[PDB]
Amino acid sequence: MKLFAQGTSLDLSHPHVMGILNVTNSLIDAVKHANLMINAGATIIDVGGESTRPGAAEVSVEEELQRVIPVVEAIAQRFEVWISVDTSKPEVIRESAKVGAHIINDIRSLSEPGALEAAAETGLPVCLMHMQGNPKTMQEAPKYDDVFAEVNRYFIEQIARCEQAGIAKEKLLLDPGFGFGKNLSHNYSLLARLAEFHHFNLPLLVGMSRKSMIGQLLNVGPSERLSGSLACAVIAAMQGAHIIRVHDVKETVEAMRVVEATLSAKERYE
Amino acid sequence: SMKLFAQGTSLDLSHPHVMGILNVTSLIDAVKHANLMINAGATIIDVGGESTRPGAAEVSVEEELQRVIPVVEAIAQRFEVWISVDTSKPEVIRESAKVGAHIINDIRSLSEPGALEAAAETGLPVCLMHMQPKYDDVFAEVNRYFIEQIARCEQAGIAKEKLLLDPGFGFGKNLSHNYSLLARLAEFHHFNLPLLVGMSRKSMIGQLLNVGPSERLSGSLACAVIAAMQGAHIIRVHDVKETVEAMRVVEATLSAKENKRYE
Ligand SMILES: Cn1cnc2c(O)nc(N)nc21
Ligand SMILES: Cn1cnc2c(O)nc(N)nc21
């Protein structure tokens, strides 16, 4: 299983670590951080210029372009690492692709007007992440009859949506969207059954690093969540997740080596 | 529904337990380290008074008793935690039980003269660990050993309800063997006995990552989670606080799963 973009490829025969580069002096520091993450073993860098947190304010397209495009450009010309961009905006998708981004990572799954068409035009890999509602209100009262079933149904529908727009399955990744319109028990129900999403025969991406599903479980703040985040990462990767999106790259890469050694000796866990 | 009974209390093995390592190979400092591990969430303390490491200095019966017994006694008097004692000597087994030890943890699986009888006399739970570097099928060999040792114990009057199995990570095993056993750990549940594992800071992490003993936390946590996801009941570690947090995540995950186990 592989992905192709910008004349290179990403081999997903072992779990990859995606380091988070939050860009909400600035350019200089961003590239410094990307370098540290690459040295720590990150093979994808995730650049995001609009907050995806509960209650977040929107960001204008001109400001998002200013935050994201020169960061993506600078990385793509200095390093060989793959680059993903967290954007919902057609114009950021186009301009990011133009300067070398490899993966379109939209928490809104190209729901914005023109996003679907801009994504397809790029020819790039696209991640489809489940979210209930939208970031302004998604965490007010998350509710599911059957969260696994509804997330699974969403993937079926969105895959169809992308295919019809000319984005082939071979370009798609799936992400259950931990924390996005989900309470604590919803998150663990999905993590417990993550392996069952392999039926789509698509790459699985997960992001749990320092999130509330760890915080609310341990009752600690964001800086005390490394051990829980590693446990989540390991649980996901043992079930065959292909990309793990994290803040703490070095520690996560070490954990994935152990997972990889265990998987090699096996005849995936489920 | 798996439980262990000892010294008038019981250990509920419906969820994983973290066992903290207390090295005593003074009494004040041993008690304070035990207090820190309990505060960090360890529910068993493993006390060792002749090191189990390779080529560690052997000690006399009297020395091991002087090292081990006062520590077991002090913990049993001050805390509600369960106590595991690392020993191979009949006399230490006997005296440890007398001052409140809950589990006999013998890396040699009660192989020394007298040890099997002394263990059976105490009525305490007994951990059977595998130790031998080469195997035709390391899992099959470890599985045969367990079959052998379980029988030997049952013959001596130690019922199956008292046994725990440990595959013995790093004990006569190379990198490949260790990960082979880790990968297939869930298959050992066919014995219907508790599984105890210890991978904390060991060579199966160190050689894989090429880092020193103090740099292996992330890898140790990965091993723990992997074992616990497969239904391992007790995890023996140096870093209790972090392991306990990781086990809490594993338990939230298993509670959401139908099988309550990954294989
Ligand atoms: C941008 N972003 C924040 N959290 C995320 C998650 O969990 N997945 C993806 N794909 N993107 C995320
Ligand atoms: C005492 N000791 C050291 N390592 C050990 C391991 O891996 N298992 C058990 N049961 N005891 C151990």
Coordinates of C-alpha atoms and ligand atoms in Angstrom, one line a residue:
Chain A
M1 CA 0.0 0.0 0.0
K2 CA 1.4 3.3 -1.2
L3 CA 0.5 7.0 -1.8
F4 CA 1.9 9.1 -4.7
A5 CA 2.4 12.9 -4.8
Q6 CA 4.8 15.5 -6.1
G7 CA 6.9 12.9 -7.9
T8 CA 7.6 10.8 -4.8
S9 CA 5.9 8.1 -2.8
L10 CA 5.0 7.2 0.7
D11 CA 5.4 3.5 1.6
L12 CA 2.7 2.5 4.1
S13 CA 4.0 -1.0 4.9
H14 CA 5.0 0.3 8.4
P15 CA 3.4 3.0 10.6
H16 CA 4.5 6.6 9.8
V17 CA 4.7 9.4 12.3
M18 CA 3.2 12.7 11.3
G19 CA 4.5 15.7 13.2
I20 CA 2.2 18.6 13.9
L21 CA 3.3 22.1 12.8
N22 CA 0.8 24.5 14.2
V23 CA 1.2 28.0 12.6
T24 CA -1.7 29.9 14.2
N25 CA 10.3 35.1 13.2
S26 CA 7.3 32.9 12.5
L27 CA 8.6 31.4 9.3
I28 CA 12.1 31.0 10.9
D29 CA 10.7 29.2 13.9
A30 CA 8.4 27.0 11.9
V31 CA 11.2 25.7 9.8
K32 CA 13.3 25.1 12.9
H33 CA 10.6 23.0 14.4
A34 CA 10.1 21.1 11.2
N35 CA 13.8 20.3 11.2
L36 CA 13.7 19.0 14.7
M37 CA 10.6 16.8 13.9
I38 CA 12.3 15.4 10.8
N39 CA 15.5 14.6 12.8
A40 CA 13.3 12.9 15.4
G41 CA 11.9 10.6 12.7
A42 CA 8.7 12.3 11.4
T43 CA 8.2 11.3 7.8
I44 CA 5.2 13.7 7.2
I45 CA 4.9 17.3 8.5
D46 CA 1.3 18.6 9.0
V47 CA 1.0 22.4 8.5
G48 CA -2.1 24.0 9.7
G49 CA -3.0 27.7 9.8
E50 CA -6.6 27.7 11.1
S51 CA -7.6 26.5 14.5
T52 CA -9.6 23.2 14.6
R53 CA -10.4 23.5 18.3
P54 CA -13.9 23.5 19.7
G55 CA -15.3 27.1 19.5
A56 CA -12.5 28.3 17.2
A57 CA -12.8 31.5 15.2
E58 CA -12.6 31.3 11.4
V59 CA -9.5 32.7 9.7
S60 CA -9.7 34.8 6.4
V61 CA -8.2 33.2 3.3
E62 CA -5.6 35.9 2.9
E63 CA -4.3 35.3 6.5
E64 CA -4.4 31.6 6.2
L65 CA -2.4 31.9 2.9
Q66 CA 0.2 34.1 4.7
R67 CA 0.5 31.5 7.6
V68 CA 0.7 28.3 5.5
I69 CA 2.1 28.9 2.0
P70 CA 5.6 30.2 2.9
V71 CA 6.0 27.4 5.5
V72 CA 5.1 24.7 3.0
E73 CA 7.3 26.3 0.4
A74 CA 10.3 26.5 2.7
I75 CA 10.0 22.9 3.8
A76 CA 9.5 21.5 0.3
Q77 CA 12.6 23.2 -0.9
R78 CA 14.9 22.4 2.0
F79 CA 13.8 18.9 3.0
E80 CA 12.6 15.6 1.4
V81 CA 9.9 15.0 4.0
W82 CA 6.2 14.7 2.9
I83 CA 4.0 17.7 3.7
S84 CA 0.3 17.7 4.6
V85 CA -1.8 20.8 4.9
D86 CA -4.8 21.3 7.2
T87 CA -7.2 23.4 5.2
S88 CA -10.8 23.6 4.2
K89 CA -10.3 26.5 1.7
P90 CA -10.1 25.8 -2.1
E91 CA -7.5 28.5 -2.6
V92 CA -5.2 27.2 0.1
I93 CA -5.5 23.8 -1.4
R94 CA -4.5 25.1 -4.8
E95 CA -1.7 27.3 -3.6
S96 CA -0.3 24.6 -1.3
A97 CA -0.2 22.1 -4.0
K98 CA 1.6 24.6 -6.2
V99 CA 4.4 25.0 -3.7
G100 CA 4.9 21.3 -3.0
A101 CA 2.4 20.0 -0.4
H102 CA 1.7 16.2 -0.7
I103 CA -1.5 15.6 1.3
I104 CA -4.7 17.5 1.6
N105 CA -5.9 17.1 5.2
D106 CA -9.3 18.7 5.6
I107 CA -11.2 18.2 8.9
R108 CA -14.3 19.2 6.9
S109 CA -13.6 16.6 4.2
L110 CA -13.8 19.1 1.3
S111 CA -17.3 20.2 2.3
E112 CA -16.7 23.9 1.6
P113 CA -17.9 25.2 -1.8
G114 CA -15.3 24.5 -4.4
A115 CA -13.1 22.5 -2.1
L116 CA -13.9 19.1 -3.6
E117 CA -13.1 20.4 -7.1
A118 CA -9.9 22.2 -6.0
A119 CA -8.7 19.0 -4.3
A120 CA -9.4 16.8 -7.4
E121 CA -7.6 19.4 -9.6
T122 CA -4.5 18.9 -7.5
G123 CA -4.3 15.2 -8.1
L124 CA -3.1 14.9 -4.5
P125 CA -3.9 12.4 -1.7
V126 CA -6.9 13.5 0.3
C127 CA -7.7 12.5 3.9
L128 CA -11.4 12.1 4.8
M129 CA -11.9 12.7 8.5
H130 CA -15.2 12.2 10.3
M131 CA -16.7 15.1 12.2
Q132 CA -20.2 15.5 13.6
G133 CA -21.4 19.0 12.9
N134 CA -18.8 21.7 12.8
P135 CA -16.0 23.0 15.1
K136 CA -18.1 25.9 16.4
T137 CA -20.7 23.6 18.1
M138 CA -19.5 19.9 17.6
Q139 CA -18.6 19.5 21.3
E140 CA -21.8 21.0 22.8
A141 CA -23.7 17.7 22.8
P142 CA -22.2 14.9 20.7
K143 CA -24.8 12.2 20.2
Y144 CA -24.8 8.9 18.4
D145 CA -27.1 5.9 18.3
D146 CA -24.1 3.8 17.1
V147 CA -20.9 5.9 16.7
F148 CA -18.9 3.1 14.9
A149 CA -21.8 2.5 12.5
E150 CA -22.4 6.2 11.8
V151 CA -18.7 6.9 11.2
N152 CA -18.5 3.9 8.9
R153 CA -21.5 5.1 7.0
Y154 CA -19.9 8.5 6.7
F155 CA -16.8 7.0 5.1
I156 CA -18.9 5.0 2.6
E157 CA -20.7 8.2 1.6
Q158 CA -17.6 10.4 1.4
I159 CA -15.7 7.9 -0.6
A160 CA -18.5 7.9 -3.1
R161 CA -18.5 11.7 -3.1
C162 CA -14.8 11.8 -3.9
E163 CA -14.9 9.1 -6.6
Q164 CA -17.8 10.8 -8.4
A165 CA -15.7 14.0 -8.4
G166 CA -12.9 12.1 -10.0
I167 CA -10.8 11.5 -6.9
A168 CA -10.0 7.7 -7.1
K169 CA -9.9 5.4 -4.0
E170 CA -6.1 5.1 -4.5
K171 CA -5.7 8.7 -3.3
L172 CA -7.9 8.5 -0.2
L173 CA -7.1 8.2 3.5
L174 CA -9.6 7.7 6.3
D175 CA -9.6 9.2 9.8
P176 CA -12.2 8.6 12.4
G177 CA -11.6 12.1 13.8
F178 CA -11.0 11.6 17.5
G179 CA -12.5 14.5 19.4
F180 CA -14.5 15.9 16.5
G181 CA -18.1 15.9 17.8
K182 CA -17.4 13.0 20.1
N183 CA -17.4 12.5 23.9
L184 CA -15.0 10.3 25.8
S185 CA -16.9 7.1 25.4
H186 CA -17.4 7.7 21.7
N187 CA -13.7 8.1 21.2
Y188 CA -12.8 4.9 23.0
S189 CA -15.6 3.0 21.1
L190 CA -13.9 4.0 17.9
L191 CA -10.4 3.3 19.0
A192 CA -11.5 -0.1 20.3
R193 CA -12.9 -1.0 16.9
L194 CA -10.4 0.8 14.7
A195 CA -9.2 -2.4 12.9
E196 CA -12.7 -2.9 11.5
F197 CA -12.2 0.2 9.3
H198 CA -9.7 -1.8 7.3
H199 CA -12.5 -3.2 5.2
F200 CA -12.3 -0.1 2.9
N201 CA -8.8 -1.2 2.1
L202 CA -7.6 2.4 2.5
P203 CA -4.8 4.0 4.6
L204 CA -6.0 4.9 8.1
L205 CA -4.8 8.1 9.8
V206 CA -5.5 8.9 13.4
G207 CA -4.8 11.9 15.6
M208 CA -5.1 11.4 19.4
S209 CA -1.9 13.2 20.7
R210 CA -2.6 15.1 24.0
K211 CA -6.3 15.2 23.2
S212 CA -9.2 15.3 25.7
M213 CA -9.8 11.6 25.4
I214 CA -6.6 11.3 27.3
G215 CA -7.1 14.4 29.5
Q216 CA -10.6 13.6 30.6
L217 CA -9.6 10.0 31.3
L218 CA -6.6 10.9 33.4
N219 CA -7.9 14.3 34.6
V220 CA -4.6 16.1 33.7
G221 CA -3.7 19.1 31.6
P222 CA -2.2 19.1 28.0
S223 CA 1.4 18.8 29.2
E224 CA 0.9 15.7 31.3
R225 CA -0.5 13.6 28.5
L226 CA 2.5 12.0 26.8
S227 CA 2.2 8.5 28.3
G228 CA -1.5 8.3 27.5
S229 CA -0.8 9.7 24.0
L230 CA 1.8 7.0 23.4
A231 CA -0.7 4.3 24.6
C232 CA -3.2 5.6 22.1
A233 CA -0.7 5.6 19.3
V234 CA 0.4 2.1 20.1
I235 CA -3.2 0.9 20.4
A236 CA -3.9 2.4 17.0
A237 CA -0.8 1.2 15.2
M238 CA -1.2 -2.4 16.6
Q239 CA -4.5 -2.4 14.9
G240 CA -2.8 -1.5 11.6
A241 CA -3.2 2.3 11.5
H242 CA -0.8 3.7 8.9
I243 CA -0.2 7.3 10.0
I244 CA -0.1 8.7 13.5
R245 CA -0.5 12.4 13.9
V246 CA 1.4 13.7 17.0
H247 CA 3.1 16.5 18.8
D248 CA 5.8 14.3 20.4
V249 CA 7.6 12.8 17.5
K250 CA 10.8 11.2 19.0
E251 CA 8.9 9.3 21.7
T252 CA 6.2 8.2 19.2
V253 CA 8.7 7.1 16.6
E254 CA 10.4 4.9 19.3
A255 CA 7.0 3.4 20.2
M256 CA 6.3 2.6 16.6
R257 CA 9.6 0.8 16.2
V258 CA 8.5 -1.6 19.0
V259 CA 5.1 -1.9 17.3
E260 CA 6.8 -2.7 14.0
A261 CA 9.1 -5.3 15.5
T262 CA 6.0 -7.0 17.1
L263 CA 4.0 -6.8 13.9
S264 CA 6.9 -8.3 11.9
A265 CA 7.0 -11.4 14.2
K266 CA 3.2 -11.8 13.8
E267 CA 1.4 -13.9 11.2
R268 CA -2.2 -7.1 12.8
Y269 CA -4.3 -7.1 16.0
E270 CA -8.1 -7.1 16.2
Chain B
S1 CA -13.4 -13.4 36.8
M2 CA -9.8 -14.2 37.5
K3 CA -8.6 -13.6 41.0
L4 CA -5.7 -14.5 43.3
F5 CA -5.9 -15.0 47.1
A6 CA -3.2 -14.5 49.7
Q7 CA -2.7 -13.2 53.2
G8 CA -6.5 -12.8 53.7
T9 CA -7.0 -10.4 50.7
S10 CA -7.4 -10.8 47.0
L11 CA -6.1 -9.4 43.7
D12 CA -8.8 -8.7 41.1
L13 CA -7.3 -9.5 37.7
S14 CA -10.3 -8.2 35.7
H15 CA -8.0 -5.3 34.7
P16 CA -4.3 -5.0 34.3
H17 CA -2.1 -4.3 37.4
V18 CA 1.2 -2.4 37.5
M19 CA 3.9 -4.1 39.6
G20 CA 6.6 -1.7 40.7
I21 CA 10.2 -2.9 41.1
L22 CA 11.8 -2.3 44.5
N23 CA 15.5 -3.1 44.4
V24 CA 17.1 -4.0 47.7
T25 CA 20.1 -6.0 46.3
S26 CA 18.1 1.5 53.8
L27 CA 14.9 0.0 55.3
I28 CA 13.9 3.6 55.5
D29 CA 14.7 4.3 51.9
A30 CA 13.1 1.0 50.8
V31 CA 9.8 2.1 52.5
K32 CA 10.0 5.5 51.0
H33 CA 10.5 4.1 47.5
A34 CA 7.6 1.7 48.1
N35 CA 5.4 4.7 49.2
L36 CA 6.2 6.6 45.9
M37 CA 5.3 3.6 43.8
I38 CA 2.0 3.1 45.6
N39 CA 1.2 6.8 45.3
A40 CA 2.0 6.4 41.6
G41 CA -0.6 3.6 41.4
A42 CA 1.3 0.4 41.7
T43 CA -0.9 -2.3 43.3
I44 CA 1.9 -4.9 43.6
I45 CA 5.5 -4.3 44.8
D46 CA 8.2 -6.7 43.7
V47 CA 10.9 -7.1 46.3
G48 CA 14.3 -8.6 45.3
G49 CA 17.2 -9.4 47.7
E50 CA 19.5 -11.4 45.5
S51 CA 19.6 -9.7 42.1
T52 CA 18.2 -11.7 39.2
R53 CA 20.5 -9.9 36.7
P54 CA 23.2 -11.9 34.8
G55 CA 26.2 -12.7 37.0
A56 CA 24.8 -10.9 40.0
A57 CA 26.7 -11.8 43.2
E58 CA 25.2 -14.9 44.9
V59 CA 24.5 -14.5 48.6
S60 CA 24.1 -16.7 51.6
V61 CA 20.7 -17.7 53.1
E62 CA 21.4 -15.5 56.1
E63 CA 22.3 -12.5 54.0
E64 CA 19.3 -12.8 51.7
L65 CA 17.0 -13.2 54.8
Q66 CA 18.5 -10.1 56.4
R67 CA 18.0 -8.2 53.1
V68 CA 14.5 -9.3 52.2
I69 CA 12.5 -10.1 55.3
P70 CA 12.6 -6.7 57.0
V71 CA 11.6 -5.1 53.8
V72 CA 8.6 -7.4 53.2
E73 CA 7.6 -7.0 56.8
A74 CA 7.8 -3.2 56.8
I75 CA 5.7 -2.9 53.6
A76 CA 3.1 -5.5 54.8
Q77 CA 2.7 -3.6 58.0
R78 CA 2.5 -0.1 56.5
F79 CA 0.6 -0.6 53.2
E80 CA -2.3 -2.6 51.7
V81 CA -0.4 -3.2 48.5
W82 CA 0.4 -6.8 47.4
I83 CA 4.0 -7.9 47.8
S84 CA 5.9 -10.1 45.3
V85 CA 9.2 -11.6 46.6
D86 CA 12.0 -12.5 44.1
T87 CA 13.8 -15.5 45.6
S88 CA 14.9 -19.0 44.8
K89 CA 15.7 -20.1 48.3
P90 CA 13.2 -22.4 50.4
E91 CA 14.1 -20.5 53.6
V92 CA 13.4 -17.1 52.1
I93 CA 10.1 -18.4 50.6
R94 CA 9.0 -19.7 54.0
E95 CA 10.0 -16.6 56.0
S96 CA 8.7 -14.2 53.5
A97 CA 5.2 -15.7 53.7
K98 CA 5.4 -15.5 57.5
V99 CA 5.8 -11.8 57.4
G100 CA 3.1 -11.2 54.7
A101 CA 4.3 -11.7 51.1
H102 CA 1.6 -12.4 48.6
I103 CA 3.4 -13.8 45.6
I104 CA 6.5 -16.0 45.2
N105 CA 8.2 -14.8 42.2
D106 CA 11.0 -17.2 41.3
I107 CA 12.8 -16.7 38.1
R108 CA 14.2 -20.2 38.5
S109 CA 10.6 -21.5 38.8
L110 CA 11.2 -23.3 42.2
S111 CA 14.0 -25.4 40.7
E112 CA 16.4 -25.2 43.7
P113 CA 16.3 -28.1 46.2
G114 CA 13.4 -27.5 48.7
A115 CA 11.9 -24.5 46.8
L116 CA 9.0 -26.4 45.4
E117 CA 8.0 -27.9 48.7
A118 CA 8.5 -24.7 50.6
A119 CA 6.3 -22.8 48.1
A120 CA 3.5 -25.4 48.3
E121 CA 3.6 -25.1 52.1
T122 CA 3.0 -21.4 52.1
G123 CA -0.2 -21.8 50.1
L124 CA 0.7 -18.6 48.2
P125 CA 0.4 -17.8 44.5
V126 CA 3.5 -18.8 42.5
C127 CA 4.8 -17.2 39.3
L128 CA 6.3 -19.6 36.8
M129 CA 8.8 -17.9 34.5
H130 CA 10.5 -19.3 31.5
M131 CA 14.3 -19.1 31.3
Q132 CA 17.0 -21.0 29.3
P133 CA 20.4 -18.5 22.8
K134 CA 18.4 -20.5 20.2
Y135 CA 15.0 -22.2 19.6
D136 CA 13.3 -24.1 16.9
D137 CA 10.0 -22.4 17.8
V138 CA 10.5 -20.2 20.9
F139 CA 6.7 -20.0 21.5
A140 CA 6.3 -23.8 21.3
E141 CA 9.3 -24.3 23.6
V142 CA 8.0 -21.8 26.1
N143 CA 4.5 -23.4 25.9
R144 CA 6.0 -26.8 26.6
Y145 CA 7.8 -25.5 29.6
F146 CA 4.6 -24.1 31.1
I147 CA 2.9 -27.5 30.5
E148 CA 5.8 -29.2 32.3
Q149 CA 6.0 -26.7 35.2
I150 CA 2.3 -26.6 35.8
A151 CA 2.3 -30.4 36.2
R152 CA 5.3 -30.4 38.5
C153 CA 3.5 -27.8 40.6
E154 CA 0.1 -29.6 40.7
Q155 CA 1.9 -32.8 41.7
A156 CA 3.5 -31.0 44.6
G157 CA 0.1 -29.8 45.7
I158 CA 0.1 -26.3 44.2
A159 CA -3.3 -26.1 42.5
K160 CA -3.6 -24.3 39.1
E161 CA -5.6 -21.6 40.9
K162 CA -2.4 -20.4 42.5
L163 CA -0.2 -20.2 39.4
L164 CA 0.8 -17.3 37.1
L165 CA 2.8 -17.7 33.9
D166 CA 5.6 -15.4 32.7
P167 CA 7.3 -15.9 29.3
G168 CA 10.5 -14.4 30.8
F169 CA 11.4 -11.6 28.4
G170 CA 15.2 -11.2 28.1
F171 CA 15.9 -14.6 29.8
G172 CA 17.9 -16.7 27.4
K173 CA 16.3 -15.0 24.4
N174 CA 17.5 -12.7 21.6
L175 CA 15.7 -9.8 20.1
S176 CA 13.8 -11.9 17.6
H177 CA 12.7 -14.4 20.2
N178 CA 11.4 -11.7 22.5
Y179 CA 9.3 -10.0 19.9
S180 CA 8.1 -13.5 18.7
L181 CA 6.8 -14.1 22.2
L182 CA 5.3 -10.6 22.6
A183 CA 3.5 -11.0 19.2
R184 CA 1.9 -14.3 20.3
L185 CA 1.4 -13.5 24.0
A186 CA -2.4 -13.8 23.8
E187 CA -2.1 -17.5 22.8
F188 CA -0.9 -18.3 26.3
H189 CA -4.4 -17.6 27.6
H190 CA -5.4 -21.2 26.7
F191 CA -3.9 -22.2 30.1
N192 CA -6.6 -20.1 31.7
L193 CA -4.0 -18.7 34.1
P194 CA -2.8 -15.1 34.9
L195 CA -0.1 -13.7 32.6
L196 CA 2.7 -11.7 34.1
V197 CA 5.3 -9.9 32.0
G198 CA 8.3 -7.8 32.5
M199 CA 9.9 -5.9 29.6
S200 CA 10.7 -2.6 31.4
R201 CA 14.0 -1.1 30.2
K202 CA 15.2 -4.4 28.8
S203 CA 17.4 -5.4 25.9
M204 CA 14.5 -6.1 23.6
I205 CA 13.9 -2.3 23.7
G206 CA 17.5 -1.1 24.0
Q207 CA 18.9 -3.1 21.0
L208 CA 15.9 -2.2 18.9
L209 CA 16.2 1.6 19.5
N210 CA 20.0 1.7 20.2
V211 CA 19.5 3.8 23.4
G212 CA 20.8 3.4 27.0
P213 CA 18.8 2.0 30.0
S214 CA 17.6 5.5 31.1
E215 CA 16.3 6.3 27.6
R216 CA 13.8 3.4 27.1
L217 CA 10.6 4.7 28.7
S218 CA 8.7 5.2 25.4
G219 CA 9.7 1.7 24.3
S220 CA 8.9 0.2 27.7
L221 CA 5.4 1.8 27.6
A222 CA 4.9 0.4 24.1
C223 CA 5.8 -3.1 25.3
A224 CA 3.4 -2.8 28.3
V225 CA 0.5 -1.5 26.2
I226 CA 1.1 -4.3 23.6
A227 CA 1.1 -6.9 26.3
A228 CA -1.9 -5.5 28.2
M229 CA -3.9 -5.1 24.9
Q230 CA -3.4 -8.9 24.6
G231 CA -4.9 -9.4 28.1
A232 CA -1.7 -9.6 30.2
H233 CA -2.7 -9.3 33.9
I234 CA 0.3 -7.9 35.6
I235 CA 3.0 -5.6 34.2
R236 CA 6.3 -5.4 36.0
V237 CA 8.0 -2.1 35.5
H238 CA 10.4 0.6 36.8
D239 CA 8.3 3.6 35.8
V240 CA 5.1 3.1 37.6
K241 CA 3.3 6.5 37.1
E242 CA 3.7 6.4 33.3
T243 CA 2.8 2.7 33.0
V244 CA -0.3 3.2 35.2
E245 CA -1.5 6.1 32.9
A246 CA -1.0 3.9 29.8
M247 CA -2.9 1.0 31.5
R248 CA -5.8 3.4 32.1
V249 CA -6.0 4.1 28.4
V250 CA -5.8 0.3 27.7
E251 CA -8.6 -0.4 30.1
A252 CA -10.8 2.3 28.6
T253 CA -10.2 0.7 25.2
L254 CA -10.8 -2.9 26.4
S255 CA -14.0 -1.8 28.1
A256 CA -15.3 -0.6 24.8
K257 CA -14.4 -3.8 23.0
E258 CA -16.6 -6.9 22.7
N259 CA -13.8 -9.5 23.0
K260 CA -12.2 -7.5 25.8
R261 CA -8.9 -8.6 24.3
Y262 CA -6.7 -8.2 21.1
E263 CA -5.2 -11.2 19.3
Ligands
LIG1 C1 -5.9 19.1 11.9 N1 -6.3 18.0 12.8 C2 -6.5 18.1 14.1 N2 -6.8 17.0 14.7 C3 -6.8 16.1 13.6 C4 -7.1 14.7 13.6 O1 -7.4 14.0 14.6 N3 -7.0 14.2 12.3 C5 -6.7 15.0 11.2 N4 -6.6 14.2 10.0 N5 -6.4 16.2 11.2 C6 -6.5 16.7 12.4
LIG2 C1 12.8 -10.6 39.0 N1 12.5 -10.5 37.6 C2 13.3 -9.8 36.7 N2 12.8 -9.8 35.5 C3 11.6 -10.5 35.6 C4 10.7 -10.9 34.6 O1 10.8 -10.5 33.4 N3 9.6 -11.6 35.2 C5 9.5 -11.9 36.5 N4 8.4 -12.7 36.8 N5 10.4 -11.6 37.4 C6 11.4 -10.9 36.9

